[PDB]
Amino acid sequence: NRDYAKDDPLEFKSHQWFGASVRSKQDKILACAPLYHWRTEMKQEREPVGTCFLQDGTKTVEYAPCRSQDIDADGQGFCQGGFSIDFTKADRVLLGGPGSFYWQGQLISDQVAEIVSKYDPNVYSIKYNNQLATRTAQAIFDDSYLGYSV
Amino acid sequence: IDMELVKRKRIEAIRGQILSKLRLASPPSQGEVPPGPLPEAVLALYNSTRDRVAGEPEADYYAKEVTRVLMVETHNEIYDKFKQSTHSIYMFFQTSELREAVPEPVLLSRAELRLLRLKLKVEQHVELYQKYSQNSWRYLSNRLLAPSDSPEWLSFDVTGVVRQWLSRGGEIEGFRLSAHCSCDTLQVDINGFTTGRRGDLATIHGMNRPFLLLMATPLERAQCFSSTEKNCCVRQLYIDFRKDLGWKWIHEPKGYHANFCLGPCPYIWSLV
Amino acid sequence: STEKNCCVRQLYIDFRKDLGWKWIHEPKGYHANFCLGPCPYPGASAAPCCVPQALEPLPIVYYVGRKPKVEQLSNMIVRSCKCS
Amino acid sequence: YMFFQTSELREAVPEPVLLSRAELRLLRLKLKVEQHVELYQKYSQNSWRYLSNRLLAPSDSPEWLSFDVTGVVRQWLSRGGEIEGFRLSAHCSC
Amino acid sequence: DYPVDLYYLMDLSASMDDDLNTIKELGSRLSKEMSKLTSNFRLGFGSFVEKPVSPFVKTTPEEIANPCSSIPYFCLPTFGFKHILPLTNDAERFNEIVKNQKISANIDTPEGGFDAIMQAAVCKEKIGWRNDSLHLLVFVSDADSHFGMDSKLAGIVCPNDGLCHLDSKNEYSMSTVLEYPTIGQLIDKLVQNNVLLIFAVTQEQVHLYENYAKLIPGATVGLLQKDSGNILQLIISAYEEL
Numbered sequence: 001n002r003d004y005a006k007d008d009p010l011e012f013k014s015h016q017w018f019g020a021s022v023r024s025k026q027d028k029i030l031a032c033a034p035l036y037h038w039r040t041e042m043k044q045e046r047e048p049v050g051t052c053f054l055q056d057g058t059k060t061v062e063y064a065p066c067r068s069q070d071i072d073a074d075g076q077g078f079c080q081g082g083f084s085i086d087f088t089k090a091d092r093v094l095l096g097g098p099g100s101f102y103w104q105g106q107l108i109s110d111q112v113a114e115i116v117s118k119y120d121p122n123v124y125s126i127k128y129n130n131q132l133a134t135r136t137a138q139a140i141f142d143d144s145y146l147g148y149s150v
Numbered sequence: 151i152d153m154e155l156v157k158r159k160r161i162e163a164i165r166g167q168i169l170s171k172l173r174l175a176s177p178p179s180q181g182e183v184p185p186g187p188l189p190e191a192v193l194a195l196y197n198s199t200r201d202r203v204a205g206e207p208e209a210d211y212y213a214k215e216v217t218r219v220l221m222v223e224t225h226n227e228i229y230d231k232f233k234q235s236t237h238s239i240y241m242f243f244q245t246s247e248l249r250e251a252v253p254e255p256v257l258l259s260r261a262e263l264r265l266l267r268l269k270l271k272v273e274q275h276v277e278l279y280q281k282y283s284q285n286s287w288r289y290l291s292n293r294l295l296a297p298s299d300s301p302e303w304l305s306f307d308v309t310g311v312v313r314q315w316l317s318r319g320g321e322i323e324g325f326r327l328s329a330h331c332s333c334d335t336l337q338v339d340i341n342g343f344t345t346g347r348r349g350d351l352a353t354i355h356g357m358n359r360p361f362l363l364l365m366a367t368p369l370e371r372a373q374c375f376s377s378t379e380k381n382c383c384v385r386q387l388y389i390d391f392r393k394d395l396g397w398k399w400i401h402e403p404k405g406y407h408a409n410f411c412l413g414p415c416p417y418i419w420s421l422v
Numbered sequence: 423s424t425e426k427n428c429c430v431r432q433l434y435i436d437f438r439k440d441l442g443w444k445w446i447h448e449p450k451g452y453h454a455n456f457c458l459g460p461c462p463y464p465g466a467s468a469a470p471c472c473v474p475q476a477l478e479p480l481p482i483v484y485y486v487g488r489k490p491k492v493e494q495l496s497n498m499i500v501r502s503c504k505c506s
Numbered sequence: 507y508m509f510f511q512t513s514e515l516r517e518a519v520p521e522p523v524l525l526s527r528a529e530l531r532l533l534r535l536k537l538k539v540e541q542h543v544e545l546y547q548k549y550s551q552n553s554w555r556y557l558s559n560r561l562l563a564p565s566d567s568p569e570w571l572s573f574d575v576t577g578v579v580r581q582w583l584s585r586g587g588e589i590e591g592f593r594l595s596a597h598c599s600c
Numbered sequence: 601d602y603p604v605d606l607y608y609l610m611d612l613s614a615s616m617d618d619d620l621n622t623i624k625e626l627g628s629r630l631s632k633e634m635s636k637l638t639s640n641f642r643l644g645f646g647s648f649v650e651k652p653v654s655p656f657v658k659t660t661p662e663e664i665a666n667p668c669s670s671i672p673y674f675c676l677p678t679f680g681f682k683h684i685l686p687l688t689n690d691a692e693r694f695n696e697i698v699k700n701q702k703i704s705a706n707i708d709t710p711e712g713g714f715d716a717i718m719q720a721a722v723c724k725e726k727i728g729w730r731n732d733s734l735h736l737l738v739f740v741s742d743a744d745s746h747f748g749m750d751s752k753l754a755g756i757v758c759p760n761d762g763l764c765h766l767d768s769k770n771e772y773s774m775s776t777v778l779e780y781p782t783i784g785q786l787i788d789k790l791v792q793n794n795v796l797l798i799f800a801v802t803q804e805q806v807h808l809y810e811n812y813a814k815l816i817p818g819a820t821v822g823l824l825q826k827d828s829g830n831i832l833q834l835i836i837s838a839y840e841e842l
């Protein structure tokens with residue numbers, strides 16, 4: 001577990017369920033941890049934003065599109081990104097996040113060329129320009145679990 | 151010698167005191183009261199009267215029935231005209247429950263509006279206003295703020311306001327909270343709605359909202375001049391310096407009225 | 423400290439124990455205290471007494487038949503004591 | 507705006523601890539209508555910080571008021587600042 | 601004249617603070633009209649909130665012991681289901697439990713309602729269902745409720761066996777171990793025990809649960825009001841038998 005500060009752990013990889021969904025495309029292997037919790041960068045929380053690790057041969061990168069500044073249940077704090085995954089034929093990743101926006105759910109798609117290139121082990125909230133995402137809707141759609149399967 | 155019964159003289163003086171402030175002769179019946187159920191609604195009343203560490207007559211010796219009323223949420227009327235902004239904060243109340251806790255405007259004794267602070271650090275200054283003509287706002291009081299690292303509970307004596315609200319049949323009232331104006335914005339964090347908290351816990355996020363604490367006299371009570379005898383009444387006594395002291399070293403003044411207290415004060419005497 | 427002069431003495435008053443009152447739900451006891459002590463050399467009264475200077479109110483909870491009334495008594499808890 | 511000299515203040519009261527009560531008294535002339543008054547203190551010889559407040563009543567005769575600035579005067583006798591003062595403006599509606 | 605059992609399943613979740621006083625006025629009122637149409641009357645009680653695991657509850661050390669934090673407010677921790685009162689004739693013991701009930705909390709509006717229905721149904725012993733009687737189970741909650749496979753997000757993939765899982769504390773011990781039950785599982789265990797499920801929810805939740813009562817045989821619905829005698833009219837017109 002990386003530390004945000006002294007005696008202040010940044011993440012909780014225990015019981016993160018890494019390997020709950022595995023998807024492979026050619027020499028690419030994508031695995032995710034839907035029960036990965038992450039502490040907010042504003043205060044001391046424990047929010048299950050989910051994270052994925054991608055291996056394209058030698059390089060291993062992290063992918064947490066729900067680990068953002070959009071915190072709390074109202075945002076992507078309980079997104080559990082990587083609950084379900086799949087690959088397209090044009091090297092785009094399809095990620096499902098059932099807990100986003102008070103469990104309205106969200107689908108996030110990023111180009112594999114951008115995932116590895118914009119990866120930075122010192123940046124915990126990476127913003128991707130070619131990101132495609134289902135934005136938040138009205139409150140009637142809460143508790144819908146969009147992204148449960150893909 | 152004195153003895154320790156002095157404590158028992160206080161207890162038996164407390165006994166007759168509580169009964170007199172409640173205008174009671176004997177304790178009421180508790181066989182018409184159900185043992186066990188104690189609502190957390192009256193526990194919030196009792197907790198809010200003991201809470202005030204912050205904030206600034208013949209009828210004033212008797213007891214006052216303490217009741218409170220919560221405010222109106224932002225889900226009905228507080229968003230239709232202004233909503234919330236960095237310039238002001240609005241709180242709204244009804245009157246069908248204000249004139250229900252205190253039916254007659256005269257019964258109202260003290261009415262303090264209490265809020266809930268959040269950590270604010272160094273300094274802020276707050277000015278309070280009242281709703282006039284349903285559109286104009288009039289100044290009330292002001293208060294400087296201290297660096298409380300913890301949530302703080304305040305109170306503002308708006309008794310003169312609430313009394314005027316009980317005399318009119320005005321079906322809607324409310325307050326306004328802006329900040330100081332240095333002339334020749336607002337940075338206070340008070341417990342609010344935040345607008346966006348949802349889920350199962352959202353319902354409890356309306357608790358601790360600004361409420362108006364009321365202390366009135368029950369309707370059941372209603373209703374040297376109180377004595378024909380020379381009671382402990384202050385007696386007249388004019389003292390001259392040249393006449394009663396013989397001191398010519400004091401030029402001014404040359405006399406004043408230094409009264410005195412004469413009369414007994416006993417208790418628990420024979421015969422209600 | 424142990425004062426020989428006008429000092430406010432501690433006194434916890436229980437309703438069930440020192441009064442026998444089970445009709446007051448809350449509280450079931452409080453610190454009213456009292457003032458005991460001499461005040462030597464200063465006026466107005468023929469004998470300067472140890473009287474309280476600051477007092478504090480007490481909220482009570484009792485029922486009336488079927489109606490519970492939360493009321494607050496004025497000046498019950500003796501904080502300070504003066505001599506006048 | 508009102509100003510005073512510290513060279514005479516620390517002569518009537520040498521030690522700041524001796525100061526017990528220091529109330530600033532003025533003199534009213536206007537007798538008609540009612541107005542709202544705010545009081546400030548001199549800081550950095552340019553900035554003014556809030557102090558107290560008082561509403562005024564339409565008294566038919568010249569009235570004499572007073573503002574308790576004891577906590578202000580006490581700190582001024584400890585400082586070597588030989589120039590201080592007060593400010594009396596009106597209400598600011600914002 | 602015929603024996604009748606009534607189990608009172610109350611939702612203690614956070615959305616119930618506005619509905620709390622209606623339930624206590626429903627308990628005492630129900631603890632009176634039952635002795636009228638029958639003499640063999642025994643009633644019980646049980647409470648539920650939510651499965652005490654992320655993401656349904658926040659996993660910060662303060663919000664575990666006090667899930668009403670950040671408001672702030674003091675409330676009971678999150679628990680799956682607690683069997684408090686076995687059904688008995690002692691009726692003033694029933695009232696004394698409903699009065700002292702405090703609110704709990706969680707995050708997600710739907711609750712673990714079915715977990716409490718399933719444990720109260722199957723446990724014919726720790727609840728104490730009569731041999732030949734009308735096994736009536738009043739279900740009260742002001743929100744939706746979780747069913748099967750909803751616990752997959754929490755990491756619970758072992759299905760609900762529909763058995764009695766009440767520990768020495770009379771709580772649902774296998775709440776973080778088993779999935780929520782489905783309408784199929786509930787239907788399969790509400791008949792093996794012969795249980796008539798009364799839904800007593802809020803207005804916005806009726807259009808939902810009435811379609812559940814259409815699936816669940818014998819299970820009916822009800823509306824919650826300040827005068828909770830509305831739900832009493834259900835039970836009295838359910839003593840028709842014949």
Ligand SMILES: *[C@@H]1O[C@H](CO)[C@@H](O[C@@H]2O[C@H](CO)[C@@H](O[C@@H]3O[C@H](CO)[C@@H](O)[C@H](O[C@H]4O[C@H](CO)[C@@H](O)[C@H](O)[C@@H]4O)[C@@H]3O)[C@H](O)[C@H]2NC(C)=O)[C@H](O)[C@H]1NC(C)=O
Binds near residue numbers: 194665
């Ligand atoms: C109105 O006020 C009354 C009392 O004036 C209040 O009843 C009391 O509520 C407090 C809640 O703060 C109870 O205190 C608790 O006591 C238990 C055991 O005695 C503690 O475990 C509790 O600790 C909590 O907080 C800890 C963190 O500081 C956690 O680690 C812990 O797990 C608990 O969550 C807490 O101190 C007190 O027991 C009751 N009094 C009685 C007689 O029961 C009432 O709730 C108030 N009403 C309101 C606020 O609406």
Ligand SMILES: *[C@@H]1O[C@H](CO)[C@@H](O)[C@H](O)[C@H]1NC(C)=O
Binds near residue numbers: 729730731
């Ligand atoms: C029901 O009958 C069984 C035997 O058939 C018996 O063991 C049990 O005690 C009975 N239950 C009650 C409540 O009488």
Ligand SMILES: [Mn+2]
Binds near residue numbers: 613615711
């Ligand atoms: Mn709920």
Ligand SMILES: [Mn+2]
Binds near residue numbers: 353615618619742
């Ligand atoms: Mn509710």
Ligand SMILES: [Mn+2]
Binds near residue numbers: 350656711
């Ligand atoms: Mn829930």
